[PDB]
Design a protein around this ligand. Structure first.
Ligand SMILES: CCCCCCCCCCCCCCCCCC(=O)OC[C@H](COP(=O)([O-])OCC(O)COP(=O)([O-])OC[C@@H](COC(=O)CCCCCCCCCCCCCCCCC)OC(=O)CCCCCCCCCCCCCCCCC)OC(=O)CCCCCCCCCCCCCCCCC
Ligand SMILES: CCCCCCCCCCCCCCCCCC(=O)OC[C@H](COP(=O)([O-])OCC[N+](C)(C)C)OC(=O)CCCCCCCCCCCCCCCCC
Ligand SMILES: CCCCCCCCCCCCCCCCCC(=O)OC[C@H](COP(=O)(O)OCCN)OC(=O)CCCCCCCCCCCCCCCCC
Ligand SMILES: NC(=O)C1=CN([C@@H]2O[C@H](COP(=O)(O)OP(=O)(O)OC[C@H]3O[C@@H](n4cnc5c(N)ncnc54)[C@H](OP(=O)(O)O)[C@@H]3O)[C@@H](O)[C@H]2O)C=CC1
Ligand code: SF4
Ligand code: SF4
Ligand code: SF4
Ligand SMILES: [Zn+2]
Lengths: 206, 94, 176, 95, 292, 144, 154, 114
């Protein structure tokens, strides 16, 4: 079938088997394990398990996930714990990838993973800057992307696209000043969603 | 291409290469800027029969993730260990 | 498959050691570098004599926008707003109403040329080849306001450039 | 069909013109008001009605794939002509 | 109100203040502050200029797209004045020179030119006219600068009776020729801050009770010229010009109690001590005693 | 070969019509090559080609000294090339408008204009829509 | 006398437009195309436009890429240190008006909010040739300058 | 109602961190006014610092207080180490923002906003 992406059952089984393997070894922290239809393994863990679970995946002989590919966050306001923390790891030894996910809210710190992966340093600063998630015991937690003195965390779903302040040069004070944002043309919100269901396979029970 | 014979010899000797065989500037060897019109082929879904969309609908074959464990034996690795690479036989060493 | 870029053991025979000593003292590899830049001195330069000579372009080139007409002179645009919807930069602003003869036509068609990313998505989305990116790339201005195109400006661009635009569309439409 | 207002400002094909008391016409002082003089509404009206011998004709605007989506126009009414919704060409069933 | 000039927005750069202002003399010291405050709130500003466009470049960032419009004009050409003002609701005249030139003497900048602007503005139907005069304007002054300011101040009041006339004291500020003048080297002075004068001008545009009035803009404190110059040198960390200019600096600042001032436009005068260092910091390589 | 190089140099003075014409193109265009005249447009621009030059230098235009009432002896502009020749000069096509002329349309500009920024003919943007809300006009006669 | 003033304007104008030394803020994508303007095909140096000049010997600032709020103060400082006469060329949609990031919380919507701008080069990015057209347009703007003619008439 | 603490385990410990931060800010203002060549007085700088603390006086959540101090320390680090420029320091004073009307009538005259 030329237009349909082919399945790979061999990889699906291997990843499923390793998913059970991880969950048997770390029952204290693993809450859910799933493999996607395009064969990506996700471990969902209690936030207490960050250091133990990441250390096990880095150091264990059947894991050896030596490379932290990415660390980011997702904001889902409807959840009690709105922030989902995502670790994407790579194992060169076994030519495999794994995703570890945990959660936190505005006021609950997450343990910094710099001790496991030195790559985590700047990623956690970016998560602090863009989402406002505090990482405990970080060697140097501060903003990395936003302007100095910037207020708020832009990547939160409830932060407006254009922010609250805009800059310009002011001649009277001979410097760049910040002022409440006004737009000559407001961003035009589009309602694009079709009112007809697209994917029956994902229908949520009513 | 307009360089005199002496200048060609000079810059060839200075560079150590035969520069005239691989000039950086393009001349007549390039494609004409006007070409005959194309007639492109059509994909495998361009059929009048035996072509119902439900048999070639990739998006509708996507499924939600398979849950292998939820909070509701031999050891394994995520995949077989990667195989050692082989040294190039075209040119193993620069 | 892999290869080593820098895994070689220098020969320690006296003939080779003296070869490296001569290179160190006589600067031979530095002299070799001088030859390469010398050989360029006597090569023809690649420079072209702009604006009397122009860099080559293809019929697909995405330049200044224009609104086109049918051969009769009627506007091609029917205010469908597909260009405005697809525009990645929201650079297009359209308003429309029935024309005096009842035709479906725009009363506003603005492109903020300083929002536009010159991506060509508008001309892909257009069902009647009304909005195109033309071949002109020499329209820099002295003021910001001059780059806020309204419908009159865009129609004038179409009348100004149609001769070239039509020929470019003729050469590429069979690839679309 | 370009005309000037009492102020002398040209009216656009969309009917736009600044009225007497509008300060905004100061933007044109020392410069000019861009106006396109080829009014499409007048140009299409100059096209003759095409006489055809069927109840239904099709229009694609000319040039095949370079025109507009092909539509079919019903010519049953003799009171008026059939007008293409895309290009404005008119058709009439003969006798 | 014509629909185009009804205010909208929140008073920022992209808002619509409803003011359409022609500012003569906008390329000078006072003009750059006036145009800035107009463009801050989204006013349409027409800038007639005599100088090179290169010399008007600092005004362009002061307004959103389209809000600052530039025009050529000649002080002696009334048609060029009519072009600049016939669409405006307020005309502000800041034209002046502290010296005379071969082509323009004080009677030109301070009488003939202001009178022509006022007359053409009257004819064109401009509702409001703001004319800057001087606190010490006086036809018996030893200064030809101040004598002309008195003659022209009278001709404007006669030509455009509803004009708001503003009489500032010496204005100090970053680009002034006052504090900077001393730093580049009997009499009581009452200098006023540039931003205070600008705010007064802006509030005069809005205040309807300001029409037909004459204001004196003065600072909060009076100083002996010697005590002021001493303070300037201390602030500039320094060990302690035409003939007409010297006469002005030695003219005591009049005290006109009957005239309304900055407090009658809602403006609090800024003490010199707060802003002196701002002006004099660049001159670096005990507050002055005030008259009660 | 050096002698042959020099004669080619001298043939450029004659190929340009003598010393004055040679100096005019040298100072106007900073280039004294002689090419084949491909054609001329109604504004006086002259178009040349020499296919022995490397791609990009094989086509050039010598701009007219006057266009639309503007002295362009020294002030030339890439926007002066009319659209029909624009396609050929940028190598978007092979053959010039003298060989494949553009399709004629009644609405196409008969007179090309160059970039008009900075002149009294510059484009000034404005809203093309009419007023949306109509205000109530009170009666002219008195009656309170 | 006015004949003298007209010819000195021509002389100083010719010198200034014939020796335009630019400072480029290579902020983003558009910096790549100015590099291609310096590259052999267009060779900006042949017009008298040196490839790189220090800010204090610069005559024209080319803002080539997106100006963020974080960078805006730094850009203004460099402009304020330029000896006069100085000109600004805004190159690309981002610098012209914010472009594809116009609605961002962190982007200045056009560098003309920070510095005055003499030439706006459109495109995302403008081609190296389009930038060269804008530079030659700035030269013509300098040719029109009449500083001494206006000085003599004050 | 059991939650993971940030630093403080109760409001008393949180308030100690607040006072340490206030002391650090109070002592740094004289240096900031000098290094950044500000045109404000040291009194103005300290009055601004006190204002910023006061608006957060009503907090009773030690975790929220902890975050406020964390952000306050980062702001102080940017100032002490001169990562900020003069424009960033002066953004606390809104020198170009004309005062918004506060009473009902003034807001009624200018627009529709509450
Ligand atoms: C010392 C002179 C050596 C020399 O220049 O010969 C160039 C000659 C041509 O070199 P090339 O790289 O092959 O040029 C490409 C074409 O052949 C070149 O062929 P072409 O078709 O381009 O020939 C036309 C061209 C050819 O150019 C010439 O006519 C050569 C004139 C150079 C004068 C020296 O004529 C011109 O453009 C005349 C323009 C004059 C340029 C300014 C030269 C003045 C220099 C003296 C300054 C004193 C005042 O080189 C040699 O023959 C090598 C021997 C010379 C010793 C080195
Ligand atoms: C000290 C004395 C130095 C005298 C310098 C004279 C420079 C010659 C010159 O101006 O070039 C001619 C220039 C050349 O013209 P151009 O500068 O406009 O350039 C045209 C040629 N292209 C298109 C390639 C750029 O003529 C003029 O532009 C007129 C201005 C003359 C300025 C000198 C006044 C005397
Ligand atoms: C009978 C017995 C008689 C007795 C007398 C016999 C004497 C003959 C034997 C002596 C010969 C010695 C030659 C002297 C030249 C200097 C040699 C030298 O200093 O080379 C070493 C120096 C650094 O070399 P390096 O690779 O860094 O390693 C050495 C340190 N570990 O390398 C360098 O200096 C590199 C220089 C870098 C700059 C490069 C730019 C120049 C390249 C082009 C130069 C062309 C030469 C110019 C010719 C002069 C023109 C007038
Ligand atoms: N600054 C002070 O201390 C006080 C000033 N005033 C008055 O306030 C007004 C402005 O003050 P200031 O801004 O300091 O004065 P400036 O000299 O700083 O600016 C004067 C303005 O007048 C313009 N101008 C001067 N002569 C002519 C002319 N012949 N034709 C056309 N335009 C001309 C200048 O334009 P160009 O740049 O083209 O020369 C400039 O824009 C003046 O009327 C001044 O007398 C009153 C009291 C105190
Ligand atoms: S080229 Fe792209 S960004 Fe520009 S108007 Fe078209 S769709 Fe919008
Ligand atoms: S230009 Fe094309 S896509 Fe855009 S509104 Fe008109 S017909 Fe639709
Ligand atoms: S204008 Fe376009 S090319 Fe230039 S920096 Fe912005 S996105 Fe990149
Ligand atoms: Zn049709």
């Amino acid at each position: 079938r030329p237009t349909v992406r082919p399945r790979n059952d061999v990889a699906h089984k291997q990843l499923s088997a390793f998913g059970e393997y991880v969950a048997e070894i770390l029952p204290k922290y693993v809450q859910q394990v799933q493999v996607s239809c395009f064969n990506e393994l996700e471990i969902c863990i209690h936030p207490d398990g960050v250091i133990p679970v990441l250390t096990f995946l880095r150091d264990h002989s059947n894991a050896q996930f030596k490379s932290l590919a990415d660390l980011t966050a997702v904001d889902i306001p409807t959840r009690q714990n709105r922030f989902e923390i995502v670790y994407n790891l790579l194992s060169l030894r076994f030519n495999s990838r794994i995703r570890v996910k945990t959660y936190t809210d505005e006021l609950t710190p997450i343990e910094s993973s710099v001790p496991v992966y030195k790559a985590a340093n700047w990623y956690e600063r970016e998560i602090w800057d863009m989402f406002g998630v505090f990482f405990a015991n970080h060697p140097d937690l501060r903003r990395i992307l936003t302007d100095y003195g910037f207020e708020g965390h832009p990547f939160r779903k409830d932060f407006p696209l254009s922010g609250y302040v805009e800059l310009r040069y002011d001649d009277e004070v001979k410097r760049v000043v910040a002022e409440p944002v006004e737009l000559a043309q407001e961003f035009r919100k589009f309602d694009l969603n079709s009112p007809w269901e697209a994917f029956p396979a994902y229908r949520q029970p009513p | 291409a307009s360089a005199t014979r002496f200048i060609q010899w000079l810059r060839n000797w200075a560079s150590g290469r035969d520069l005239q065989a691989k000039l950086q500037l393009r001349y007549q060897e390039i494609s004409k800027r006007t070409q005959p019109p194309p007639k492109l082929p059509v994909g495998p879904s361009h059929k009048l029969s035996n072509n119902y969309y439900c048999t070639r609908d990739g998006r509708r074959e996507a499924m939600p993730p398979s849950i292998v464990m939820s909070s509701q034996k031999k050891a394994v690795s995520p995949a077989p260990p990667i195989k050692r690479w082989e040294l190039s036989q075209d040119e193993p060493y620069l | 498959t892999y290869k080593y870029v820098n895994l070689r053991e220098p020969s320690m025979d006296m003939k080779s050691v003296t070869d490296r000593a001569a290179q160190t003292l006589l600067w031979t590899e530095l002299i070799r570098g001088l030859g390469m830049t010398l050989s360029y001195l006597f090569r023809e330069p690649a420079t072209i004599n702009y604006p009397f000579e122009k860099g080559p372009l293809s019929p697909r080139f995405r330049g200044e926008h224009a609104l086109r007409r049918y051969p009769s002179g009627e506007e091609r645009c029917i205010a469908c707003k597909l260009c405005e919807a697809v525009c990645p930069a929201q650079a297009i602003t359209i308003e429309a109403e029935p024309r005096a003869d009842g035709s479906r036509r725009t009363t506003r068609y603005d492109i903020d040329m300083t929002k536009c990313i010159y991506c060509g998505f508008c001309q892909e989305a257009c069902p009647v080849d009304a909005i195109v990116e033309g071949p002109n790339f020499e329209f820099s201005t002295e003021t910001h306001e001059e780059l806020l195109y309204n419908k009159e400006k865009l129609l004038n661009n179409g009348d100004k450039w149609e001769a070239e635009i039509a020929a470019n569309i003729q050469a590429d439409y069979l690839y679309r | 069909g370009v005309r000037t207002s009492p102020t002398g400002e040209k009216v656009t094909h969309t009917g736009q013109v600044y009225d007497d008391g509008d300060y905004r016409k100061v933007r044109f002082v020392g410069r000019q008001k861009e106006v396109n003089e080829n009014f499409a509404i007048d140009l299409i009206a100059e096209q003759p009605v095409s006489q055809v011998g069927s109840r239904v004709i099709s229009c694609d605007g000319g040039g095949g794939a370079l025109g507009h989506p092909r539509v079919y126009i019903n010519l049953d009414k003799e009171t008026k002509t059939g007008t293409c919704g895309y290009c404005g060409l008119q058709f009439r069933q003969q006798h | 109100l014509h629909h185009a000039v009804i205010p909208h927005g929140k008073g920022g750069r992209s808002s619509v203040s409803g003011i359409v202002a022609t500012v003569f003399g906008a390329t000078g010291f006072l003009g750059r502050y006036v145009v800035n405050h107009l463009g801050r709130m989204g006013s349409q500003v027409i800038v007639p200029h005599r100088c090179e466009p290169y010399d008007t470049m600092h005004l362009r960032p002061m307004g959103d797209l389209g809000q600052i419009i530039f025009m050529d004009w000649n002080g002696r050409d009334k048609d060029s004045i009519r072009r600049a003002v016939e669409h405006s609701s307020v005309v502000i005249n800041l034209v002046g020179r502290e010296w005379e030139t071969q082509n323009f003497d004080f009677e030109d900048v301070f009488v003939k030119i202001p009178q022509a602007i006022a007359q053409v503005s009257k004819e064109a139907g401009v509702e409001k006219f703001i004319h800057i005069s001087h606190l010490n304007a006086d036809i018996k002054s030893s200064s030809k600068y101040l004598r002309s300011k008195a003659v022209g101040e009278k001709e404007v009041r006669e030509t455009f009776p509803e004009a708001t006339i503003i009489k500032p004291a010496e204005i100090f500020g970053r680009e002034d020729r006052f504090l900077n003048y001393f730093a580049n080297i009997k009499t009581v002075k009452q200098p006023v801050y540039i931003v205070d004068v600008t705010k007064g001008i802006i509030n005069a545009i809005k205040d309807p009770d300001a029409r037909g009035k004459t204001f004196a803009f003065v600072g909060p404190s009076r100083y002996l010229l010697f005590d002021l110059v001493q303070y300037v040198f201390a602030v500039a960390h320094r060990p302690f010009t035409t003939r007409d200019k010297v006469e002005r600096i030695h003219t005591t600042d009049k005290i006109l109690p009957h005239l309304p001032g900055l407090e009658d436009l809602g403006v609090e005068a800024t003490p010199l001590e707060l802003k002196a260092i701002e002006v004099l910091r660049r001159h670096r390589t005990q507050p002055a005693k005030t008259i009660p | 070969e050096l002698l042959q190089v020099l004669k080619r140099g001298l043939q450029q003075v004659s190929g340009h019509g003598g010393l004055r014409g040679y100096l005019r193109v040298l100072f106007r265009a900073n280039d004294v090559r002689v090419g084949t005249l491909v054609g001329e447009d109604k504004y006086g621009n002259k178009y040349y080609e020499d296919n022995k030059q490397f791609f990009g230098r094989h086509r050039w235009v010598i701009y007219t000294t006057e266009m639309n009432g503007k002295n362009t002896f020294w002030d030339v502009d890439g926007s002066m090339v009319p659209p029909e020749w624009h396609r050929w000069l940028h190598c978007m096509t092979d053959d010039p408008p003298t060989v494949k002329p553009p399709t004629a349309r009644k609405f196409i500009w008969t007179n090309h204009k160059f970039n008009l920024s900075g002149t009294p003919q510059q484009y000034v943007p404005y809203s093309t829509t009419r007023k949306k809300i109509q205000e109530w006009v009170p009666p002219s006669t008195p009656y309170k | 006398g006015e004949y003298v003033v007209a010819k000195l304007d021509d002389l100083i104008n010719w010198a200034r437009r014939s020796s335009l030394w630019p400072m480029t803020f290579g902020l983003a994508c558009c910096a790549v195309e100015m590099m291609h303007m310096a590259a052999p095909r267009y060779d900006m140096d042949r017009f008298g436009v040196v490839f790189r000049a220090s800010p204090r010997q610069s005559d024209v600032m080319i803002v080539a890429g997106t100006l963020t709020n974080k960078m805006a103060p730094a850009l203004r400082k460099v402009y304020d240190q330029m000896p006069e006469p100085r000109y600004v060329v805004s190159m690309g949609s981002c610098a012209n008006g914010g472009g594809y990031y116009h609605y961002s919380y962190s982007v200045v919507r056009g560098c003309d909010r920070i510095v005055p701008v003499d030439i706006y080069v459109p495109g995302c990015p403008p081609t190296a040739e389009a930038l060269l057209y804008g530079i030659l347009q700035l030269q013509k703007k300098i040719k029109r300058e009449k500083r001494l003619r206006i000085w003599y008439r004050r | 109602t059991s939650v993971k603490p940030i630093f403080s385990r109760d409001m008393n410990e949180a308030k100690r961190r607040v006072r340490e931060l206030y002391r650090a800010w109070y002592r740094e203002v004289p240096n900031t006014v000098h290094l950044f060549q500000l045109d404000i007085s040291v009194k103005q700088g300290r009055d601004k610092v006190r204002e910023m603390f006061k608006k957060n006086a009503h907090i009773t959540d030690p975790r929220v207080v902890d975050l406020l101090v964390i952000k306050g320390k980062m702001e102080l680090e940017e100032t002490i180490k001169v990562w900020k420029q003069r424009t960033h320091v002066m953004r606390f004073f809104h020198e170009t923002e004309a005062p918004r009307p506060k009473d009902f009538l003034s807001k009624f005259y200018v627009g529709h906003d509450p």
